[PDB]
Amino acid sequence: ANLIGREELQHARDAVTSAQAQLDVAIQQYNANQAMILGTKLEDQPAVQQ
Amino acid sequence: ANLIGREELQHARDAVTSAQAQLDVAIQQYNANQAMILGTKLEDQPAVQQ
Amino acid sequence: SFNNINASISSINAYKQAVVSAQSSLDAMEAGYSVGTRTIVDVLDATTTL
Amino acid sequence: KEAIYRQLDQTTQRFNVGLVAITDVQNARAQYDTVLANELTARNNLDNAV
């Protein structure tokens, strides 16, 4: 309806995109350190068997 | 009673959720540190016996 | 004289709207104080405006 | 009058979206009524000067 400035909407879209990027970073941080805990059971982990 | 903007209330509830999540983070950190001691006696710790 | 009567009608409408706005502000300020987010100076100022 | 009407339109849209409280709508409505009264007075003064 042409009420608010365009730089305000630009800054809103940029914020949403940045938040998406940060969530991707967090998900990736989780995916790593899940490669170590692949085995379901604690007694079957490679370190314990050694 | 419609005496406050809705965006403010949404922000307040979001703040509560974020605080709860960060408290969970801190609790998990504590648990991770405590898992290596298990509340036994000092003389019986694995390294001391090693 | 005729034009003056018309102007008086319009002014009355404006002042009624102003009164309603002030009442809403006072109610907001009073509720905030009841929940503990505002002082009593704000309540008195709202009363003065009303 | 045109400027204040556009201001009221923006404020009402914003309240509907959920970013401002009802109290701010009342202020815009009051200002709109005040400018309406001022315009009526200006027209009456032009007629009286004629």
Swiss-Prot record, chains A, B:
Q: What is its subcellular localisation?
A: Cell inner membrane
Domain of life from the UniProt record: Bacteria
Query: What does this protein do, in the record's words?
Result: Part of the tripartite efflux system EmrAB-TolC, which confers resistance to antibiotics such as CCCP, FCCP, 2,4-dinitrophenol and nalidixic acid. EmrA is a drug-binding protein that provides a physical link between EmrB and TolC.
The family assignment reads: Belongs to the membrane fusion protein (MFP) (TC 8.A.1) family.
Q: How does it assemble?
A: Homodimer and homotrimer. Part of the tripartite efflux system EmrAB-TolC, which is composed of an inner membrane transporter, EmrB, a periplasmic membrane fusion protein, EmrA, and an outer membrane component, TolC. The complex forms a large protein conduit and can translocate molecules across both the inner and outer membranes. Interacts with EmrB. EmrAB complex forms a dimer in vitro.
This chain's protein is named: Multidrug export protein EmrA
Curated annotation (Swiss-Prot), chain C:
Q: What is the effect of changing D45A?
A: Decreases inhibition by hexaamminecobalt(3+)
Provide the phenotype resulting from gene inactivation. Cannot grow on efflux substrates novobiocin or fusidic acid.
Q: Where in the cell is it found?
A: Cell outer membrane
What is known to happen upon mutating D42A? Decreases inhibition by hexaamminecobalt(3+)
Q: How does it assemble?
A: Homotrimer. Part of tripartite efflux systems, which are composed of an inner membrane transporter, a periplasmic membrane fusion protein, and an outer membrane component, TolC. The complexes form a large protein conduit and can translocate molecules across both the inner and outer membranes. TolC interacts with the membrane fusion proteins AcrA, EmrA and MacA.
Q: What does this protein do?
A: Outer membrane channel, which is required for the function of several efflux systems such as AcrAB-TolC, AcrEF-TolC, EmrAB-TolC and MacAB-TolC. These systems are involved in export of antibiotics and other toxic compounds from the cell. TolC is also involved in import of colicin E1 into the cells.
Q: What is known of its domains?
A: Forms a continuous, solvent-accessible conduit: a 'channel-tunnel' over 140 Angstroms long that spans both the outer membrane and periplasmic space. The periplasmic or proximal end of the tunnel is sealed by sets of coiled helices.
Q: Which family does it belong to?
A: Belongs to the outer membrane factor (OMF) (TC 1.B.17) family.
Q: What is this protein called?
A: Outer membrane protein TolC
Q: Which gene encodes it?
A: tolC
